[PDB]
């Protein structure tokens, strides 16, 4: 049977190129550590770019972040305090255990690996992988390089895959073998690609 994703309730206050605009935002954030052993709930209310009001479960109540929210925090604590507290279980914990566990956290996308040449530099391209955790290693005739190794930051593609580029500072000699070596949760054993001078 279909399982329902739940949401954190936005509480309400009491009561164009050159045109002015006005913006408001609400952010409901669930922080999980070791599955659902530690949950932290943080909800934010923001006017334009100024967060003025926050619920943080480590605090236990709404607080004004700036002066704009001084009276907001007193209203929200009267009207939504214990509803928001309970959301830690009815929304964060439920969503992780019942909807992330069977989807987001079972997602495994294996990386693709290709070496190309740009003294000189080898570029190992590691692409289309999910989740983010990965290790990339360079070897030269069976021995691991550690000096001369640099990588780009992790690139988030937005489609639930990442990529990264890992570069090796190298001078090609002889008939050496350079190997790009990738370890990843989708892979029971590493993927390797060899490049020969």
């Amino acid at each position: 049977h279909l399982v329902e994703r739940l949401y954190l309730v936005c509480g309400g206050e009491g009561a164009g190129g050159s045109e002015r605009h006005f913006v408001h935002q609400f952010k409901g954030e669930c922080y999980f550590t070791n599955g659902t052993q530690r949950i932290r709930l943080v909800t934010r209310y923001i006017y334009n770019r100024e967060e003025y009001l926050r619920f943080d479960s480590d605090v236990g109540e709404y607080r004004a972040v700036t002066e704009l929210g001084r009276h907001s925090a007193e209203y929200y604590n009267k009207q939504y305090l214990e509803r928001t507290r309970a959301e830690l279980d009815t929304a964060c914990r439920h969503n992780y255990e019942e909807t992330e566990v069977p989807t987001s956290l079972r997602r495994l996308e294996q990386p693709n690996v290709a070496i190309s040449l740009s003294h000189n530099t080898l570029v190992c391209s590691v692409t289309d992988f999910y989740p983010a955790k990965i290790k990339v290693r360079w070897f030269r005739n069976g021995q691991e390089e550690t000096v001369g190794v640099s990588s780009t930051q992790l690139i988030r593609n937005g489609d639930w895959t990442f990529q990264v580029l890992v570069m090796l500072e190298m001078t090609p000699h002889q008939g050496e073998v350079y190997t790009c070596h990738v370890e990843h949760p989708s892979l029971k054993s590493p993927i390797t690609v060899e490049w020969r001078a």
Binding site: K27, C30, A132, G158
Partner: protein, 182 residues
């Protein structure tokens, strides 16, 4: 910055006026799960297999947006009608996978520092605009309460084919092009 293994945004809402522009999404570990189309009242999953076992009632998006319409009115007045500042976005173009002659690929335009969340991202091949094979994410939230956004173009890499990612935004005097070639 809070330490955690995982982060769900189970409720990200933005509303602005005038113009009645709003958005509701969920994210997990920084990727979009879905947005509620607020006018059609339906849930639109980032990848279609997300909704095969899981359901999200669009009414939750409607709840959040109505509350935010109300909150916008109150806080606008309390701020003495301080207007938002139009930011200048910045774009980076890169391929989804290594570029290979004749092998279908995806060009990705990442656009950051978007605020307010209203923008145009379009593509040009050899200075001519391209509409087929184009997908665009929702506005995705940043720690500093700006937004980012990605547009995707399907392409066959060839020799000296030339692409530009074109961004127009209120914070830009003229559209900025971000170039790209293999």
């Amino acid at each position: 910055d809070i330490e955690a293994d995982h982060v769900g945004f189970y409720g990200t809402t933005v509303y602005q006026s005038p113009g009645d522009i709003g958005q509701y999404t969920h994210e997990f570990d920084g990727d979009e799960l879905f947005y509620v189309d607020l006018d059609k009242k339906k849930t639109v999953w980032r990848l279609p297999e997300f909704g095969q076992l899981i359901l999200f009632e669009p009414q939750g998006g409607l709840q959040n947006i109505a509350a935010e319409k109300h909150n916008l009115g109150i806080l606008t007045k309390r701020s003495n009608f301080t207007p938002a500042t139009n930011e200048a976005p910045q774009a980076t173009v890169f391929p989804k996978s290594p570029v290979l002659l004749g092998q279908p690929n995806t060009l990705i335009c990442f656009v950051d520092n978007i605020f307010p969340p209203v923008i145009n991202i379009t593509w040009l091949r050899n200075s001519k605009s391209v509409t087929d094979g184009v997908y665009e994410t929702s506005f995705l939230v940043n720690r500093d309460h700006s937004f980012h956004k990605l547009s995707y173009l399907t392409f066959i890499p060839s020799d000296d084919d030339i692409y530009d990612c074109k961004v127009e935004h209120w914070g830009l005097e003229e559209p900025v092009l971000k170039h790209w070639e293999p």
